[PDB]
Design a protein around this ligand. Structure first.
Ligand SMILES: CCN1CNS(=O)(=O)c2ncccc21
Ligand SMILES: CCN1CNS(=O)(=O)c2ncccc21
Ligand SMILES: N[C@@H](CCC(=O)O)C(=O)O
Ligand SMILES: N[C@@H](CCC(=O)O)C(=O)O
Lengths: 259, 263
């Protein structure tokens, strides 16, 4: 029957089409992950229904209740059959759900308003005039929380107690905060999203420094799902045919507005 | 039953696995050093097994004979039950995933171009549009298969040339490709993984360089026979080492910290 796909509104991965209010079902949406879902479904031979994750989150486990939220929770608790989204492969998630081989590479990166005197994470950690933070309920925040790497641990110690909160509910809110804070806020986000925004009007942000880590997004399934093997082979087939590169070029470079 | 020493297949490929100085008087795992030797030790510690490193007999990564359908190389060692795990720069591919299991990648790479410094080549398109400079790949690996299978015009054109070139543009080992670049006065370019390319660019006599972008994007994984009980633990260990920053430290250790071409 119809495979329930959980995904998340995150540009350019999944976006509402122009005039979506008169559209229905999968046709409401467009983007990299919408295209990828169609390709994966064709290769594996299933029909599917795109559903936007109810709580709008990627997935974290509450320290006390030990309940998972976000897309990870939807998989864990049986609300969706598969997640096709910019969902980061991590140790803690691999303990509770399955991931395909990665379909896209990324690392944590720094976004600044152009002209901000920051070149690195070390720079951020050694000052206090420029505030910085991350997305809530995602892998970037969990990276800093868990990290024993000295610069990142120092950064976490500042971020977790900063007032007002330096954490944001959505990627778009982080970007807006960079753009509105006259250089006094820098946002820690994945290189994929940073690079997309850097090529969008008003062309006032940039990625500075190297990436802080190296990882990937995978297609996720509940542990022991029958779909896992076919989905993994489909990712590798699309990779080897060059279609993942084509999709990246379509939704990043072609979406470029800054010349 | 009782714990058994895990047989690890690997390959003599610098800087992943190399003969130590004084290897002639050393035994067992102590004979070897490198990135994958260090990685093996970390994986074994995390998963709680003892192991024996064994260099693959035929010195190949792994390809399936089109006629006999027999796998050679490290892939073959796993398929036919001669090794329990491969800890090596073994590329994750579709055809290999059909017959063995891979961890999540522990290193990223892409196919790339190695030239002798000063060679007037900047891209694969450049190579494809001329005949003065020969070019080829390693035998029995994923780079050769990439060109054989590609439907992208430039890479297909490159394959049509390479497959029929005389004398043969293919090499049996990475070292042979490097020698051919170094000795051919700019008239041979070598197609190899970016990891290997970047390593050699930091070795004396500092006469090669990587040019252009990478032609694809993939990774190396730790491989096990299909359905092996080791796979889950090994995968979690790769991800833990990744998150801890240790894979990045190992890359720096073996590529750059003792690079020979300056700071
Ligand atoms: C080698 C670090 N790494 C860690 N393993 S991973 O999260 O599957 C991943 N995916 C894509 C690129 C790199 C990568
Ligand atoms: C996203 C392309 N890709 C394809 N899947 S892969 O071979 O597991 C891989 N590993 C590391 C980095 C990239 C990568
Ligand atoms: N890709 C992340 C969300 C973005 C972020 O945390 O920066 C995740 O899967 O949690
Ligand atoms: N890593 C490759 C070998 C090197 C190459 O083909 O360039 C493999 O696993 O086949």
């Amino acid at each position: 029957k119809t495979v329930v796909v959980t995904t998340i509104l995150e540009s350019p991965y999944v976006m509402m089409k122009k005039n979506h209010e008169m559209l229905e079902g999968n046709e409401r949406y467009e983007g990299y992950c919408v295209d990828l879902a169609a390709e994966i479904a064709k290769h594996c031979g299933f029909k599917y229904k795109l559903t936007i994750v109810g709580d709008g989150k990627y997935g974290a486990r509450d320290a006390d209740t030990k309940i998972w939220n976000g897309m990870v929770g939807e998989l864990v608790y049986g609300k969706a059959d598969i997640a096709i989204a910019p969902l980061t492969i991590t140790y803690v998630r691999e303990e509770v759900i399955d991931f395909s081989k990665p379909f896209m590479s990324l690392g944590i990166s720094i976004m600044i308003k152009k002209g901000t005197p920051i070149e690195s994470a070390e720079d951020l950690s050694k000052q206090t005039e420029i505030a910085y933070g991350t997305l809530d309920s995602g892998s970037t925040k969990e990276f800093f929380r868990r990290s024993k790497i000295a610069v990142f641990d120092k950064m976490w110690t500042y971020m977790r107690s900063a007032e007002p909160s330096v954490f944001v509910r959505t990627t778009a809110e982080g970007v807006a905060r960079v753009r509105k804070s006259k250089g006094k806020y820098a946002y820690l986000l994945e290189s994929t999203m940073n690079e997309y925004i850097e090529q969008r009007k008003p062309c006032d942000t940039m990625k500075v420094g190297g990436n802080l880590d190296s990882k990937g997004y995978g297609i996720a399934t509940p542990k022991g799902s029958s779909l896992g093997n076919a989905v993994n082979l489909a990712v590798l087939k699309l990779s080897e045919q060059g279609l993942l590169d084509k999709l990246k070029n379509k939704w990043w470079y072609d979406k470029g507005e800054c010349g």
